[PDB]
């Protein structure tokens, strides 16, 4: 039974670790959409591209 | 569906709590992420009838 638990606990840790890395990519895009909402939607940007 | 497995699992202890706190933080951020993108408005404005 312990062997199954060690594998299952590792699989949950790999999922949680991967979701934290994926959450950081979405946090960066949410942060750019928040900057784009303020400087494109709420004002005209002079930044290029 | 196994009480026998559950008794053995408690020996690790911190593993289940750490996973739930980590997943709970991801969940709260997902809500903060959508309130920074779209709650940039203090009041709900409406377009005119014509």
């Amino acid at each position: 039974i312990d062997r199954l638990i060690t594998g299952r606990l590792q699989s949950l840790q790999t999922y949680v670790t991967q979701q934290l890395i994926r959450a950081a990519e979405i946090r960066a895009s949410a942060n750019l959409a928040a900057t784009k909402m303020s400087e494109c939607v709420l004002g005209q940007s002079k930044r290029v591209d | 569906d196994s009480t026998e497995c559950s008794n053995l699992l408690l020996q690790y202890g911190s593993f289940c709590t750490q996973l739930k706190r980590a997943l709970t933080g991801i969940a709260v951020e997902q809500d903060k992420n959508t309130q920074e993108v779209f709650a940039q408005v203090k009041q709900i404005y409406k377009t005119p009838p014509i």
Partner: protein, 89 residues
Amino acid sequence: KFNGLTVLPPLLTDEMIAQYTSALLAGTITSGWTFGAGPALQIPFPMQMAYRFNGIGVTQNVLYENQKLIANQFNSAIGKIQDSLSSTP
């Protein structure tokens, strides 16, 4: 649903996420840059645009003098967006 795996619902409903976009879209049409830096102050939309041309180096004479053409090129451009997406790239 699953072996312990649940999907917790988003706090902001798709209708609430869609009235935020509508207010963001009506403060912009009615006032302009104004609703983000203080109380939202009204200006006619052809006028908000004349200020946005003045702010990219072109001058105000160009929008009033080409208002219908800029408005029609603008309307036609908005139409293709749905068609390109519906056709699907």
